[PDB]
Amino acid sequence: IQITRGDSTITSQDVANAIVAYGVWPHYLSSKDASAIDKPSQPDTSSNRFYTLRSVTWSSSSKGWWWKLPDALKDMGIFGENMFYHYLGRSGYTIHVQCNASKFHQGTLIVALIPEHQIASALHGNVNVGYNYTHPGETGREVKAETRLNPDLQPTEEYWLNFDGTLLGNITIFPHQFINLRSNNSATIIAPYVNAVPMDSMRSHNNWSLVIIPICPLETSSAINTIPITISISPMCAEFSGARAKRQ
Amino acid sequence: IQITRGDSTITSQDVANAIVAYGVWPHYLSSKDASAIDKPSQPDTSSNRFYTLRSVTWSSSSKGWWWKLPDALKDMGIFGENMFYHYLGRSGYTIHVQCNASKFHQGTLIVALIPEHQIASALHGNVNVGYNYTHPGETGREVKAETRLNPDLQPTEEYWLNFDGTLLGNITIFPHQFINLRSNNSATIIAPYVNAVPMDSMRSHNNWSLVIIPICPLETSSAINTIPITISISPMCAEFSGARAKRQ
Amino acid sequence: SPGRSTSGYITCWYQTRLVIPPQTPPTARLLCFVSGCKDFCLRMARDTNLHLQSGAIAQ
Amino acid sequence: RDEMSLESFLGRSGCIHESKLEVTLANYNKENFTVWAINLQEMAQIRRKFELFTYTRFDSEITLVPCISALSQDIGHITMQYMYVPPGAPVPNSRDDYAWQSGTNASVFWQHGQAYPRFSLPFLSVASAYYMFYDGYDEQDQNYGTANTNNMGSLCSRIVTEKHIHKVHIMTRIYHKAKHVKAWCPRPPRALEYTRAHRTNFKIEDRSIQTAIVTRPIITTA
Amino acid sequence: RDEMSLESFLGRSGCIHESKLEVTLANYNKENFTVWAINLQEMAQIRRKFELFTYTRFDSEITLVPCISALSQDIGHITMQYMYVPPGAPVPNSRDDYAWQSGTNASVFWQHGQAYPRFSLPFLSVASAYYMFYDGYDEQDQNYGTANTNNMGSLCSRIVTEKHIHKVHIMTRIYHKAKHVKAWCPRPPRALEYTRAHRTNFKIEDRSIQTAIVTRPIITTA
């Protein structure tokens, strides 16, 4: 089947065998939890549609990829603008990861959505991760062997340590889904807003972090020996506050 | 009193002794008149607020001023963007003209809202008015004696001929209001959309044209011998169609 | 009559390329159809310009 | 007030166009046919009347008054063909163009001694009214003032007979009549001479602006 | 959608045939009469329209527009006789053939200054419809394509007057109009020039096949 949401519509979503992060469905901020007493209203279905990032290439040597939300969507039409022209904001998402392969391809991905995924820096000593590298945008972050710049600002490349000192394989404690090519070829996660406060500065704080690690290497005898992984994200109950003048 | 509409609020509007152009109140396009059968809906109170242009200076030698709608608001936040990122659009307005003076000032203005105000070119021969000059933006068009460029593109300066070959003084056939300093100091006109079609290309066609001619010269003995004329325009039932991607 | 600034566009893009197993044609074709809907309608008949007859039509 | 109704004011018939056609011997086709883009703005009197409103809508009644004049050599019997080409349809450009026999166009044949031809046209625009004024521009941002939706088609005429042609002159007065009239947004009356079609231009070269206002020596004496 | 009805699309009148007759002095009979086998396939525009369907059925309305031209020597008054010969009936082959006075045929007399002649014809075929196309053959297994049941008769014309004949030219435009139209089995529109009547042949000598499809340099740019 196909999930048409807004002016966007993604085919191949099918049935609803997706995971709902922590069992809580994305909801609008209730007045009881609200920060400034209550706001008259915040109903806007304008930012609620599907933004499909460029498909990443999964090769026989791919070690992993990760994106951070809301960061990844900072440049996605309405949502992007909204979060740029507002001081505070909160949002849930419906991440949809799917890859095209055949019955002659084999491989497995772990698609996990990690809350407050605080990355660890690459080097030893008194170093820390720099702003630019945890905010790669929709491009995401690919695990590479090549040497990079402001090295002491760079985050770790140890994917098997979840990029934060924990063991991959325990990463299943977070809302996730496995993508076993011979069984399924897509996964879906519906996550609500998660933070210790009602809303926040989307610019400085990334609530969720989408991680994708190939637990079982991709193998195939096809001419081109790589397949694409397509990611579609859709904001859920997005709300904003402290709007500022735009086009100024 | 004060009319607070949106995040904007203008004081001194007072009672409702304003004029309602052609007796028709601004309304949303009814499905019966609609062009493409009917559209599910078009409810958006976001562009409905007050945009206050810079105050123009009324001196003892001022001959007149005119603005064109929607042109004047092409750069006014939401409304401006909306009309820039949509192919078609229609809108009514609530023009609010008011000037600050004292009981020691005397003068009179004719504030008229003219539909399809087709201007006449300044020169003789086979000339015509150029796009740039009928689209001055929020700056408006002031009657000047100074010589300008692309002269054969320039519109006429004959304010007493309504800028189109008719006699000022017959200009009262259009929705208008007089501003006799010793009586009132403001005027208000609520005009609905006027055209031979449901919607149009706001970029190429200016429905209304706001004209302001001093029928009785401004006179006073004050130090500074000039007063300001403040104009506040508010879209009414603005609707748009054929939306395009922005920030691209 | 066709307009450019008054006309829409239909664009087709690769979200991903063609994925295929071994021993399979590396390329595949795509077809495109078009028809009007229920609301489609025409008015004020004229002569088609898609057919210009400048021949004998000898019997 | 019945005579002050729009129907009475604009619904009267007037000569909107004079069409002259002369037999030319050099080439059979030549430019014997005559083509005229229907326009009610060509006659100042008629124009000023309609320009009293911003938008107007109405049906039309065209009546044709053919005036044949034979310099010499008889040629008394000639058949005339008047054709109406709808907006957007291709207009003829030769006396034997295919347009003359097309069925999408409307034609009326008139041979002298016959009642004057006459036919009706419905409201032609793609908009809901004709624009008497237009504070807008072209798609190219040029030719501001004129409106494309206002097109009303063309009136064409050709001499149908063949060789009996002995250099005779044909005058065809075209009378138009607005029926079932409707108007919107009255405007002040035109106060100056017109100088261009589809433009409110009024400035004339080396001539002072002249209004209908007559000046008097002193305001205390009527 | 009323204007998109068959009645609106095919029911419009068009000139299906031009008929010229010239006074010849040598022999009184000569070939002064003109005979034309009614056929709506002679005009490409009209043909393509009907060929949009496989079978069609309809009644007809023939209107005649006579155009007399006198080179010289007056001869102003002449009487014309237009005759319709039904399918299967013998056609005239002399200006004084008996056919001209037969009562099974239909004739209409026209003298200049008279209203244009006009008459109606019912559905003529022996079949239930006219064939726009025919994937069949003759009884002799030849002339495949054309259908004999499709015959519609002939339009004939002769100058009736006698000696007042001073070598004058007669042009008779024949207008036909399909009434109460019915059509079956729509087909794709004709994409090439016609080359033969009653044949879908399209290949022209020493010329490349040219369609209405306009080519562009690259498909990524509209």
DSSP letter string, D107-161: EEEEETTSPPPEEEE----SSSSEES---B--TTS-STT--GGG---EEEEEE--
Token pair 């007809």 is at which residue?
E60
Rounded Cα distance, D55 and D60, in Å:
16
| Contacts of C37 by beta carbon, 8 Å cutoff, 6+ apart | none
N-terminal to C-terminal alpha carbon distance within chain B: 43
**Cα dihedral A38→A42→A47→A49 (10° resolution):** 100
Tell how far CA A197 is from the center of its chain.
Answer: 20
Burial code (b: 16+ CB inside 10 Å, e: under 16) for D173-195 equals ebbbbbeebbbbbebbebbbebb
| Contacts of B175 by beta carbon, 8 Å cutoff, 6+ apart | B19, B20, B21, B22, B112, B113, B189, B191
Token pair 């300066």 is at which residue?
B157
Residues of D in contact with E14 (CB under 8 A): 101-103
SS3 at position A90:
strand
Token pair 């005759």 is at which residue?
E83
Query: For residue D9, what are its two tokens?
Result: 């004011």
Nearest to B95 by CA among B230, B1, B2: B230
Query: For residue E145, what are its two tokens?
Result: 């394509």
Rounded Cα distance, D195 and D73, in Å:
43
Token pair 């996550």 is at which residue?
A191
Rounded Cα distance, E56 and E50, in Å:
8
DSSP-derived secondary structure letter, A200: B
From residue A153, alpha-carbon distances to A71, A124, A204, A209 in Å are: 18, 11, 16, 19
Rounded Cα distance, B162 and D135, in Å:
14
Please provide the DSSP assignment of chain E as one string: -GGGSHHHHT-S-EEEEEEEEE--SS-SSTT-SEEEE--TTSSHHHHHHHTTSSEEEEEEEEEEEEEEE--SS-----EEEEEEE-TTSPPP-STT-GGGG-SSSEEEEEETTSPPPEEEE----SSSSEES------TTS-STT--GGG---EEEEEE---S---S-EEEEEEEEEEEEEEEES--PPP-S---STT------TT-----SPPP-S-TT--
Q: Would an 8 Å CB–CB cutoff place D210 in contact with chain B?
A: no
| Contacts of D84 by beta carbon, 8 Å cutoff, 6+ apart | D62, D105, D106, D107, D119, D121, D153, D154, D155, D156
Q: For strands A65-68 and A208-220, give the pairing.
A: antiparallel
Amino acid (1-letter code) at residue A92: G
Nearest to B17 by CA among B228, B208, B178: B178
**Consecutive H or E run containing D9:** helix D6-9
Query: E141: left (phi > 0), else alpha (psi -120 to 50), else beta?
Result: left
Rounded Cα distance, A62 and A59, in Å:
5
Rounded Cα distance, B137 and B74, in Å:
7
| Contacts of D125 by beta carbon, 8 Å cutoff, 6+ apart | B196, D149, D150, D151
Rounded Cα distance, D111 and D119, in Å:
16
Tell how far CA B81 is from the center of its chain.
Answer: 18
**Consecutive H or E run containing D6:** helix D6-9
Contact between chains at B161 and D189 (C-beta distance less than 8 A): no
Amino acid (1-letter code) at residue D133: F
Q: Which chain A residue has the Cα nearest residue B248?
A: A77
Amino acid (1-letter code) at residue A97: V
Nearest to D200 by CA among B142, B134, B198: B134
Cβ atoms of D210 and D201 closer than 8 Å: no
**Cα dihedral B98→B104→B109→B111 (10° resolution):** 20
Contact between chains at D144 and B134 (C-beta distance less than 8 A): yes
Q: Would an 8 Å CB–CB cutoff place B196 in contact with chain D?
A: yes
| Contacts of B45 by beta carbon, 8 Å cutoff, 6+ apart | B6
Q: How many domains does chain A have?
A: 1
Cβ atoms of B36 and B193 closer than 8 Å: no
φ, ψ of residue B159 to 5 degrees: the values are: -55, -40
Rounded Cα distance, E41 and E198, in Å:
8
Touching subunits for chain D (3+ Cβ pairs under 8 A) = B, C, E
Rounded Cα distance, E106 and E86, in Å:
8
* The dihedral sign for the CA sequence B53, B55, B56, B58: positive
Q: Which residues pair with A105 in a beta bridge?
A: A220
Rounded Cα distance, B230 and B54, in Å:
7
Residues of A in contact with B245 (CB under 8 A): 77
Cβ atoms of E158 and E121 closer than 8 Å: no
Positions of E strands within A151-225? 176-180, 186-191, 208-220
Cβ atoms of E166 and E72 closer than 8 Å: yes
Rounded Cα distance, B170 and D52, in Å:
12
Query: For residue D85, what are its two tokens?
Result: 């080409």
Rounded Cα distance, A101 and A185, in Å:
8
Rounded Cα distance, B141 and D163, in Å:
64
**Consecutive H or E run containing D7:** helix D6-9
Quick one: chain B helix, strand, coil %, rounded to 5? Answer: 10, 35, 50
Nearest to D196 by CA among D153, D122, D143: D143
Rounded Cα distance, B68 and B129, in Å:
14
Rounded Cα distance, B127 and D166, in Å:
44
| Residue in A78, A246, A247 to test binding to B, most B beta-carbons within 10 Å | A247
Q: Which chain D residue has the Cα nearest residue C48?
A: D89
Please provide the DSSP assignment of B147-166 as one string: --SSTTTSBP--GGGTTTTB
Residues of D with CB under 8 A from a CB of C: 86-90, 102, 104, 139
**Consecutive H or E run containing A58:** strand A56-58
Q: Which residues pair with B121 in a beta bridge?
A: B155
- CA E69 to chain C, closest CA, distance in angstroms equals 27
Please provide the DSSP assignment of A101-140 as one string: --TTEEEEEEEEEEET----BSSSSS----HHHH--GGG-
Q: Which residues pair with C30 in a beta bridge?
A: none
Rounded Cα distance, C22 and E14, in Å:
63
**Cα dihedral A34→A35→A41→A46 (10° resolution):** -90
Query: For residue A66, what are its two tokens?
Result: 């990760």
Rounded Cα distance, B105 and B182, in Å:
8
Query: E104: left (phi > 0), else alpha (psi -120 to 50), else beta?
Result: alpha
Residues of D in contact with E112 (CB under 8 A): 77, 111
Query: D45: left (phi > 0), else alpha (psi -120 to 50), else beta?
Result: alpha
From residue C57, alpha-carbon distances to D153, E120, E193 in Å are: 31, 27, 8
Separate counts of helices (H) and strands (E) for chain C: 0, 0
SS3 at position D52:
coil
Nearest to A62 by CA among A110, A115, A22, A96: A110
Nearest to B210 by CA among B76, B99, B135, B117: B117
| Contacts of A234 by beta carbon, 8 Å cutoff, 6+ apart | A5, A8, A48, A49, A50, A51, A93, A94, A96
Query: For residue E94, what are its two tokens?
Result: 């002399």
Nearest beta carbon to residue A81 from set B75, B80, B247: B247
Rounded Cα distance, D120 and D124, in Å:
11
Rounded Cα distance, C18 and C32, in Å:
18
Amino acid (1-letter code) at residue E93: N
- CA E167 to chain C, closest CA, distance in angstroms equals 29
Q: Which residues pair with A106 in a beta bridge?
A: A219
Nearest to A210 by CA among A140, A157, A156, A145: A140
Query: For residue E159, what are its two tokens?
Result: 């100058």
From residue A32, alpha-carbon distances to A24, A25, A35, A43, C7 in Å are: 17, 18, 9, 17, 50
Q: How many CB atoms lie within 10 A of CB A239?
A: 23
Rounded Cα distance, B117 and B121, in Å:
13
Interface of D with E in 91-150 (CB under 8 A): 98, 101-104, 109, 111, 113
N-terminal to C-terminal alpha carbon distance within chain E: 31
SS3 at position A226:
coil
Q: Which domain holds residue A97?
A: 1-248
Nearest beta carbon to residue C51 from set E9, E42, E190: E190
φ, ψ of residue D100 to 5 degrees: the values are: -60, -20
DSSP-derived secondary structure letter, A185: S
Rounded Cα distance, B235 and B93, in Å:
5
Cβ atoms of A65 and A142 closer than 8 Å: yes
Rounded Cα distance, C14 and A87, in Å:
36
**Consecutive H or E run containing B113:** strand B105-115
Nearest to D6 by CA among D178, D191, D187, D189: D178
Give the full edge-to-edge strand order of the sheet including B141-142. B141-142, B65-68, B208-220, B105-115, B176-180
Residues of E in contact with D76 (CB under 8 A): 76
Cβ atoms of E67 and E172 closer than 8 Å: yes
List chain B gaps (C–N > 2.5 A) by preceding residue: none
Rounded Cα distance, A74 and A53, in Å:
12
Q: Do A and E have ≥3 inter-chain CB pairs under 8 A?
A: no
Rounded Cα distance, B140 and D102, in Å:
52
Rounded Cα distance, B97 and B112, in Å:
10
Please provide the DSSP assignment of C6-33 as one string: T--------SS-----SSS-S-------
Nearest to D198 by CA among D4, D37, D28, D65: D37
- Residue B166: which CATH number? 2.60.120.20
Cβ atoms of B211 and B72 closer than 8 Å: no
DSSP-derived secondary structure letter, B197: S
Rounded Cα distance, B100 and B104, in Å:
12
CATH class of E1-222: mainly beta
| Contacts of A39 by beta carbon, 8 Å cutoff, 6+ apart | A241
From residue A242, alpha-carbon distances to A245, B44, B228, E114 in Å are: 10, 20, 33, 86
Rounded Cα distance, D169 and A79, in Å:
74
A-B C-beta contacts closer than 8 Å: 14
Cβ atoms of A239 and A199 closer than 8 Å: yes
Alpha-helical runs (H) found in chain A: 77-84, 131-134
- State yes or no: cis peptide before A70, omega within 30 of 0: yes
Q: Which chain A residue has the Cα nearest residue C26?
A: A223
Nearest beta carbon to residue D188 from set B125, B128, B162: B162
Experimental method: X-ray
Cβ atoms of A147 and A81 closer than 8 Å: no
SS3 at position A2:
strand
Query: For residue B172, what are its two tokens?
Result: 């009262």
φ, ψ of residue A80 to 5 degrees: the values are: -55, -50
Q: For strands B176-180 and B8-11, give the pairing.
A: unpaired
Rounded Cα distance, D136 and A177, in Å:
58
Alpha-helical runs (H) found in chain B: 77-84, 131-134
Rounded Cα distance, A113 and A21, in Å:
8
**Consecutive H or E run containing D8:** helix D6-9
Cβ atoms of D178 and D58 closer than 8 Å: yes
| Contacts of A74 by beta carbon, 8 Å cutoff, 6+ apart | A80, A83, A84, A135, A137, A138, A202
N-terminal to C-terminal alpha carbon distance within chain A: 43
Rounded Cα distance, B78 and B81, in Å:
5
Cβ atoms of A235 and A48 closer than 8 Å: yes
From residue D174, alpha-carbon distances to A177, D42, D117, E78 in Å are: 81, 12, 10, 32
> What is the residue extent of each domain of chain D?
1-222
Rounded Cα distance, E187 and B82, in Å:
46
Q: Would an 8 Å CB–CB cutoff place C32 in contact with chain E?
A: no
From residue D169, alpha-carbon distances to C12, C33, D46, D70, D164 in Å are: 62, 57, 27, 7, 13
**Cα dihedral D184→D189→D194→D198 (10° resolution):** -10
Amino acid (1-letter code) at residue B38: D
Rounded Cα distance, A22 and B51, in Å:
46
